[PDB]
Specification:
Chain lengths: 39, 97, 40, 82, 68, 241, 116, 132, 48, 45, 147, 160
């Protein structure tokens, strides 16, 4: 149990990576948070 | 005894030790002050010796403390106070010596 | 009562050695098949 | 504490009279709880004896740990024990 | 609901003959007498696949377990 | 404790030195849990078919979540339906309770009666030394209402077979029953711990007629020899041969 | 003719089956939504898979010696083509059928001849 | 002749009410060196129970299931009173707000031991059993 | 322990030199020499 | 708990006794009970 | 002609909350004891019956218990013919923030053509199902289909 | 702000016996359960997890449960809105008793009128009674201002 520092771009790239690794509704709201963060 | 249980702990060591007055305050949930046990209503008097915050009574009562029936409430202790303090009768000889 | 109060004063810690103290805490004893552990 | 290195192992290379017992116990448990069997069945139904057929060929996972009273312990694969 | 197999009057089973007769009016340009190609010599087991209402294809569009 | 009967004993020479013959009553009133796999599926299903009032029927069901469906009130129709669906994913969620999904991998636990391969503990009060409490194989006998075992166990339990009853225990899990089956099985208690002297073995009648028969003055035609050899063997009740 | 009559079970009725009396079939279908659909064509035969529970989906389940006694003549529904019910994404039907010998004047389904 | 698969449990200690196994039999099973059998017959078949403990304070009674956090939501995550003092905080059956006492685990142990802890707390003497 | 060899159970025939030497062929396979001799040391202690 | 069906959204809700009743994903306030597997037997008449 | 009746009843707990107390009853069983001889066979666990289970007259339909008393009450099937249950409905009592105080059971009753029921062509020519003659004792055309 | 958090935690996972061939299987099996479900150990909601590696201990099996246990290291993506500082959301429902906002298109916010400064006023339309504009004190209208920035108390606050 421990924490580390992070910023938003690595969070976005990691979320992308996470959509990539694991392959429903979970992934749907993930798509939602994705199109929310970007642009 | 169920094979599907995931119990992950391990009791590693038991250690004894007396508890002070302060810790009894933190754990206890209630205090009994009324020597009355039951009312004409046949019901546990609040703050009384059958306090439903001490635990769920039978006849399908829910604990006032844990808000669950008697199947799942592990019972929650209470405390009764006295500004006397008299010595502890087990350590009596050791205390006096 | 006696051993009880005596252990209460000092507060000596057994880990748990005899399979009897093992037994009062429900865990298996340290003897027999219960001495060793099996893995994956 | 420490884990004893595989190179230096003083515990008896023999399958103790107790070790076989506990091993077969858990192997029956796994198999009974829908675990993969690494030996062909011969029509066998008791989930437990099946583990006997498994041990008889020593085709079995679930290495064992032998704890020295000091605090060290050995890790013996079932295929490595006698 | 569904086309009632084993017609009342006749003893002929007809439940098979529904989509096979539907795609006769549908694309064969022949009128209802395409059932004559089906082999319903009588009128009894004949008047079923003729004037049967297949309401269930409209009832089935009512799954509350449509997940949508 | 639970799952432990208590009955009067009478010996029997037919059964085994290992197995204990049990009346069907206990086989009904003593049941233990069992996960169901694909290959043991037919056995368990059959036991569930037989029902809770006919050996080797099954007691009742426990769901993977942990609940416990009984089997006395049902009819054999409902039994049949429950049995056919005794092995299937019935949990109506990947983890019905919360986000702790190990329940997808559990099985339906069938509580089944005891049968001819079961290991059930025997004991006697007072139990002085470890051969005074051992593990026996189960064989279910029909008819009698009294637990039967072989003489050769008389000596180890030292019981006089006058009425002195016994405690009859049954391990729940698989590891405990395997352990009783291998370490403390009656067959593994032949040399007492005090000295190496074996205590289990034959008694007055066996030693007597053994003396008589063994004497060189004896003779047998083919009929007697075959009948006697088979009579002792009876491999089928044991198998393996 | 290869069968023996069913003794209708009077009270005390449960255990009145055998393998020389009756036969059992089964079916179980859950219409899954088919994902290979291009667009909206409410056929729905191609929009969904197993939307129609036919008669060809009542599989005979042998009962012991039956499997052998009819190994020369495997028993089936004589019309494997009838549509029995219709299904859609999500729902399911699961059951098994018990068939015996019966005489027409008891039930019409027992009358074998379509028209005499 | 008395069979008992199960039945009534005691008022106080949840024991099958008044077959005897132990205190000489224990010598027997441990003579065979058959631990799992012992823990099976005397702990499992007799009184098996799950109870929480405060991992830090090491007490077994200062535990309590949290109360009325939100709707049915997630589980009522038990907490400790002795180790205590928006999501973290919670309330009491009487309404006393609190916080902390999070480090809580679930352990198997015979309920008769729980009774012992009860009547020993009745003496102000209590053990602080830790866990790993 | 207690002259380690073992409690009475498997030390009853240690004294029975003759009966061991009598057959020894059931026994040599019962002990499964081909496996034992693999992983164990023999000559050091036999020499000492 | 009990498992129900949000009428419109069509989403399993897993609600428990003595609880506010509504769809968790869309907010609907009407829900049916799913049909468990329960042995029922019928005659063919 | 296969008659199928839908008799739909609702149950509501507010009516038995006359005054003086808040909402007290809740559908299901008071935690603890529960009659099995009928109830658990019909009522699923929620005090609500199984979906599609056959009922009879003297048969519980739904179960609510009082909070204070902690005792289970029951509702029987007034009707006097075997009826099943096609669906049960948990009515959100209000805008929200309300326990399920209304339930709706839709019972399906089967009415095949029975002796004593009425038929009529579209000319007012009403008739009555008298005997359901055996299909073989019926006359037939030269084609043979029976009337 | 930087309300996003990734934290490599170590857990005591319960490996099923049937997945004894590969632990990663049963690990991800329930790891897909933690996603989007609050990990209370850290008090946040799982958003992502990778680096599924176990401290190799050839997992010790329970004494009587065939499913074993092992420590595994994985990296979570909890989002911690612990009343830190200014965050922002898209308004979805607006009515003069509280305002409903969506943060990150998922999570909800009910800022009541009391945590809102009294100076802002609501307009109750003709087509809709409650679906209307909580026009600010400035008079700026808030629906097309779908984004509202605010501070969190745990639950939101608009009072300054
Ligand atoms: Zn409580
Ligand atoms: Zn016709
Ligand atoms: Zn604490
Ligand atoms: Zn909804």
């Amino acid at each position: 149990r421990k924490s580390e520092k992070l910023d938003k771009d690595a969070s976005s790239k990691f979320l992308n990576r996470y959509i990539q690794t694991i392959e429903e509704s979970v992934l749907s709201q993930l798509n939602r948070v994705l199109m929310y963060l970007k642009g | 005894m169920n094979i599907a249980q995931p119990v992950s702990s391990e009791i590693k060591s038991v250690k004894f030790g007396i508890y002070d007055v302060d810790d009894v305050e933190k754990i206890s949930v209630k205090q009994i002050v009324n020597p009355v046990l039951l009312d004409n209503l046949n019901h546990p008097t609040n703050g009384g010796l059958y306090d439903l915050a001490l635990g769920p009574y039978l006849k399908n009562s829910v604990c006032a403390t844990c808000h669950l029936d008697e199947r799942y409430c592990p019972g929650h202790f209470g405390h009764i106070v006295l500004p006397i303090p008299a010595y502890h009768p087990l350590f009596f000889s050791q205390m006096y010596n | 009562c006696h051993f009880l109060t005596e252990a209460a004063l000092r507060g000596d810690v057994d880990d748990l050695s005899n399979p009897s103290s093992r037994l009062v805490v429900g865990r298996v004893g340290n003897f027999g098949t219960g001495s060793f552990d099996i893995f994956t | 504490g420490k884990a004893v290195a595989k190179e230096d192992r003083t515990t008896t290379p023999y399958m103790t009279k107790y070790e076989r017992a506990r091993i077969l116990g858990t192997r029956a448990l796994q198999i009974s709880m829908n675990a993969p069997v690494l030996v062909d069945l011969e029509g066998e139904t008791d989930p437990l004896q099946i583990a006997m057929k498994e041990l008889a060929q020593k085709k079995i996972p679930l290495l064992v740990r032998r704890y020295l009273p000091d605090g060290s312990y050995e890790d013996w694969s079932v295929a490595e024990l006698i | 609901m569904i086309i009632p197999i084993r017609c009342f009057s006749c003893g002929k089973v007809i439940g098979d003959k529904w989509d096979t007769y539907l795609t006769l009016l549908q694309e064969d340009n022949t009128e209802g007498e395409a059932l004559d190609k089906l082999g319903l010599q009588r009128y009894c087991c004949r008047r079923m696949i003729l004037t049967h209402v297949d309401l269930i294809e409209k009832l089935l569009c009512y799954n509350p377990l449509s997940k949508q | 404790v639970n799952y432990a009967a208590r009955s009067v004993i009478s010996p029997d020479p037919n059964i085994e030195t290992n197995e204990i013959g049990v009346p069907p009553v206990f086989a009904t009133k003593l049941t233990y849990p069992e996960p169901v796999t694909l290959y043991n599926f037919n056995e368990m299903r059959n036991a569930v078919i037989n029902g809770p009032h006919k050996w080797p029927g099954a007691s009742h069901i426990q769901n993977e979540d942990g609940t416990l469906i009984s089997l006395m009130p049902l009819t054999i129709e409902q039994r049949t339906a429950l049995a056919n669906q005794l092995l299937t994913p019935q949990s109506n969620l990947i983890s019905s309770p919360y986000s702790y999904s190990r329940l997808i991998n559990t099985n339906k636990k069938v509580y089944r009666h005891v049968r001819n391969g079961d290991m059930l503990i025997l004991n006697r009060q007072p139990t002085l030394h470890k051969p005074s409490m051992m593990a026996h194989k189960a064989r279910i006998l029909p008819g009698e209402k009294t637990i039967r075992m072989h003489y050769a166990n008389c000596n180890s339990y030292n019981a006089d077979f006058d009425g002195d009853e016994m405690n009859m225990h049954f391990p729940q899990s698989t590891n405990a029953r395997s352990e009783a089956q291998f370490i403390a099985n009656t067959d593994s208690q032949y040399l007492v711990p005090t000295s190496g002297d074996p205590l289990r073995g034959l008694i007055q009648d066996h030693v007597v007629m053994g003396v008589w028969l063994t004497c060189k003055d004896t003779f047998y035609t083919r009929d007697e020899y075959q009948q006697l050899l088979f009579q002792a063997l009876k491999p089928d009740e044991t198998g393996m041969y | 003719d290869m069968f023996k009559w069913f003794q209708h079970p009077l009270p005390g009725q449960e255990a009145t089956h055998t393998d020389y009396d009756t036969v059992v079939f089964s079916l179980n279908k859950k219409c899954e939504f088919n994902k290979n659909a291009a667009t909206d064509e409410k056929d729905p035969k191609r929009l969904y898979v197993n939307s129609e529970v036919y008669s060809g989906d009542l599989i005979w389940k042998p009962q012991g010696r039956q499997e052998e006694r009819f190994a020369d003549n495997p028993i089936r529904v004589v019309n494997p083509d009838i549509v029995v019910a219709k299904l859609r994404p999500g729902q399911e039907i699961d059951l098994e059928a018990h068939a015996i010998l019966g005489i027409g004047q008891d039930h019409a389904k027992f009358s074998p001849v379509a028209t005499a | 002749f008395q069979v008992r698969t199960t039945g009534p449990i005691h008022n106080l200690t949840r024991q099958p009410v008044k077959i005897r196994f132990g205190e000489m039999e224990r010598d027997a099973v441990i003579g065979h060196g058959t631990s799992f059998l012992m823990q099976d017959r005397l702990m499992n078949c007799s009184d098996y129970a799950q109870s929480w403990v405060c991992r830090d304070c090491g007490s077994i009674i200062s535990i309590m299931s949290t109360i009325s956090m939100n709707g049915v939501g997630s589980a009522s995550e038990v907490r400790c009173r002795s180790c205590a003092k928006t999501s973290d905080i919670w309330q009491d059956g009487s309404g006393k707000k609190f916080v902390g006492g999070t480090n809580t685990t679930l352990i198997a142990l015979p309920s008769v031991f729980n009774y012992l802890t009860a009547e020993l707390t009745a003496m102000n003497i209590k053990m602080m059993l830790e866990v790993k | 322990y207690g002259e380690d060899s073992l409690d009475v159970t498997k030390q009853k025939h240690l004294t029975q030199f003759e009966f061991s030497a009598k057959n020894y062929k059931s026994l040599i396979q019962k002990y499964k020499v081909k496996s034992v001799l693999s992983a164990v040391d023999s000559e050091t202690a036999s020499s000492y | 708990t009990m498992i129900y069906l949000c009428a419109d959204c069509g989403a399993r809700n897993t609600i428990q006794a003595k609880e506010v009743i509504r769809c968790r994903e869309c907010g609907h306030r009407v829900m049916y009970k799913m049909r468990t597997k329960r042995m029922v037997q019928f005659e063919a008449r | 002609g296969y008659g199928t009746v839908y008799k739909g009843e609702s149950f509501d707990l507010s009516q038995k909350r006359r005054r003086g107390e808040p909402v007290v009853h809740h559908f299901g069983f008071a935690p603890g004891s529960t009659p099995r001889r009928e109830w658990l066979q019909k009522l699923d666990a929620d005090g609500l019956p199984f979906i599609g289970i056959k009922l009879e007259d003297g048969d519980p339909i739904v179960a609510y218990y009082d909070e204070s008393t902690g005792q289970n009450f029951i509702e029987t099937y007034h009707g006097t013919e075997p009826g099943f249950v096609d669906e049960v409905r948990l009515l959100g009592n209000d805008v929200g923030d309300s326990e399920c105080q209304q339930i709706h059971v839709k019972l399906r009753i089967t009415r095949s053509p029975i002796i004593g029921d009425k038929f009529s062509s579209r000319h007012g020519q009403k008739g009555i199902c008298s005997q359901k003659w055996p299909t073989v004792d019926m006359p037939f055309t030269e084609s043979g289909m029976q009337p | 702000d930087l309300s996003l958090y990734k934290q490599t935690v170590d857990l005591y996972l319960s490996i099923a016996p049937g997945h004894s061939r590969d632990p990663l299987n049963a690990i991800q099996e329930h790891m897909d359960s933690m996603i989007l479900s609050k990990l209370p150990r850290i008090n946040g909601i799982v958003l992502a997890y990778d680096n599924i590696r176990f401290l190799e201990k050839s997992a010790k099996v329970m004494y009587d449960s065939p499913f074993s246990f092992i420590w595994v290291r994985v990296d979570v993506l909890v989002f911690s809105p612990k009343k830190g500082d200014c965050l922002e959301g898209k308004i979805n429902l607006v009515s003069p008793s509280h305002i409903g906002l969506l943060i990150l298109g998922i999570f909800n916010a009910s800022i009541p009128r009391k945590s809102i400064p009294k100076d802002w006023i609501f307009i109750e339309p003709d087509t809709t009674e409650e679906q209307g504009r909580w026009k600010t004190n400035d008079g700026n209208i808030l629906e097309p201002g779908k984004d509202l920035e605010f501070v969190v108390d745990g639950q939101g606050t608009l009072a300054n």
